[PDB]
């Protein structure tokens, strides 16, 4: 029994709590111990509710908001985009970080309705101390901000299936936060869940701190209160560029990810024709239901292995997803929302969009320029030279105007001046060894640039 050998070594660790050891051992048990395609059903409009059908007063809206807590997933670092510290503290636009804008937006909500919707940041051991220091700057803000630290699990050395860390030794490299599905046991273990319940809060709105579209939506909250759904996942129509989908399966809604799709149906799953929606990671969950299901040990989400290398040594990081929890909640639904609620910043190409003239900031909210009639955003592709935020900023003296852009692709050592306008289809391909400069004031429209001769 490899399970006993691992549980015994986990028990000797002194860096994490007994609750965390038990949760990790549980994940390992499921990992060590596929959907039936013919049973999958497309959700009806009663199971995935189109946003246009939602039922449309300051004081009554306060009564709704008084039941809400806003939780932002803040356990991840800015590594992908070349930044240290929490991903949420990268600057988005006009010097404001993701977390800055979240705070201003809740301040706006509190002012308009005379409420105090609490903000709860779910940190990880990778972000918690920095976030504690950072949230000192909101001390004078019209907001109640709290934080908690999610679970800390040991990485598993793949070769011998033993924990990487050891008793009484430091080192972040030995550990990992076990995904966003951990929000539910962590809300409980940290004590925040009992406090929220005791305060009369009833629903938590969960979202990634890097989704600029994930604002509190009164119509959605109103629907949940009126119909007592225990869980609502916001989905949005699939495009070619898109993720897990909601299905009806054995009489209730559940998330389906490609990992659970048998090989012979992966192409049908990946197609655009059968599944029309995907999960935005905007989640609304009933707090009493979480407590019930955490205490019943019912939240047995699919294990996501997420393997990694620590100084070239292969490790396992067993994780779970927050969206996968939906199949355990009663009266669970999807809501199919417009894509304006799905604006994740995952790459510097997304920063280009939000920092451009395509958007502006209005009281903390990211507002799309109405002069772009096309509701689709331009496609933007940049080479690895632009991967890191600082390098992306250096290579754009100003952000080009892209209101009329269809698509931009840039590769090679390219440096943009200021005051540039891009229209239609623009490709810029700097050949090997060429440091290509796009001049100040350039207008590029339906143009392929392959060298200085094209400028």
Author numbering: 13 to 45, 50 to 72, 76 to 261, 264 to 476
Sentences from the paper on this structure:
UGPase is an enzyme ubiquitously distributed in all types of organisms and catalyses the formation of UDP-glucose, the key precursor of the sucrose biosynthesis and cell wall metabolism in plants. Among the various enzymes, UDP-glucose pyrophosphorylase (UGPase; EC 2.7.7.9) is important and essential in this carbon regulation, whereas the sugar, UDP-glucose, represents an important branch point in the C channel directing for synthesis of starch, sucrose or cellulose. To better comprehend the regulation and activity in the reactions involved in the saccharide metabolism, UGPases from different types of organisms have been characterized over the years. It is known that oligomerization plays a role in the regulatory process of these enzymes affecting their function and activity. Recently, the UGPase from sugarcane (ScUGPase-1) was characterized, showing that the enzymatic activity and regulatory mechanism are similar to those reported for other UGPases.
In this study, we present the first crystal structure of UGPase-1 from sugarcane at a resolution of 2.0 Å. The crystals have the symmetry of the triclinic space group P1 and diffracted to 2.0 Å resolution. The crystals of ScUGPase-1 contain two molecules per asymmetric unit, labelled monomers A and B, eight sulfate ions from the crystallization buffer, three molecules of ethylene glycol from the cryoprotectant solution and 353 water molecules. Similar to other UGPases, each monomer of ScUGPase-1 contains three domains: an N-terminal domain, a catalytic domain and a C-terminal domain. The catalytic domain consists of a mixed nine-stranded β-sheet (β1-β6, β9, β10 and β13) as a core, surrounded by six α-helices (α3-α9), and resembles a Rossmann fold. The C-terminal domain consists of 10 β-strands (β14-β23) and two α-helices (α11-α12), with the motif RFKS419IPSI, essential for the phosphorylation and binding with 14-3-3 protein, between α12 and β17. Hence, the uridinyl group is likely stabilized by Gly94, Gln169 and Gly198, whereas the glucose portion would be coordinated by Asn227, Gly265, Glu278, Asn300 and Leu92, though no electron density was observed for Gly265 in the structure of ScUGPase-1. A slight difference observed in the active site of ScUGPase-1 is the orientation of the side chain of His199. In the AtUGPase structure, the side chain is orientated closer to the β-phosphate, whereas in the ScUGPase-1 structure it is orientated closer to the α-phosphate. Analysis of ScUGPase-1 revealed a buried surface area of 480 Å2 between monomers A and B, and a complexation significance score (CSS) of 0, indicating the corresponding dimer is unlikely to be stable.
